[PDB]
Amino acid sequence: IAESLRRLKEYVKAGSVKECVAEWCNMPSVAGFDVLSEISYDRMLENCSNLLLLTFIYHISLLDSVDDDRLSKRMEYISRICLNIDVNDPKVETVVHPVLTLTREALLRQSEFFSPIFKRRLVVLLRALDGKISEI
């Protein structure tokens, strides 16, 4: 964890966005997520491949923290990426359906422990994920 945090911190400073996301996905710690969270989702969309973006939301869905502020960031990243992602990109055709399915299931598995604010926010997020699965 500690070696990885050091790399993440330096990638954020340099503005190495893809590198930040890829580093965190390889070592998806809570502390690392908090460093990465300095990078807004729009920068991620400009710099990361669709495969990497799907790797990222999958890892966010598994992260074992339900703290309100952290969960807010978790859900915002997932929402924005899933609304932006082109589910018809051939490069992700063999992963996009199972990844969206696993992402939804992962969030539901944690949902009993979400505060009421985020139980309600999840209903909205699930609708967005289901809409993307509906396209394909």
Residue numbers in the entry: 935 to 1070
What does the paper say about this structure?
Processing bodies (P-bodies) are cytoplasmic micrometer-scale ribonucleoprotein (RNP) foci that were initially identified in mammalian cells and that have now been observed in distant branches of eukaryotes. To obtain insights into the redundancy of P-body formation, we turned to the Pdc1 protein that was recently implicated in P-body integrity in S. pombe. Pdc1 can thus interact with Edc3 through a number of HLMs at its far N-terminal region and with the decapping complex through the Ge-1c domain at its far C-terminal region.
The structure displays a closely packed helical bundle, where the three N-terminal helices make an approximate 90-degree angle with the five C-terminal helices. Previously, it was shown that the C-terminal 290 residues of Pdc1 interact with Dcp2.10 To probe if this interaction is direct, we performed NMR chemical shift titration experiments with the 15N labeled Pdc1 Ge-1C domain and an unlabeled Dcp1:Dcp2 decapping complex (Dcp2 residues 1–95). We observe that resonance signals from residues that are located in the C-terminal helices of the Pdc1 Ge-1C domain are significantly perturbed.
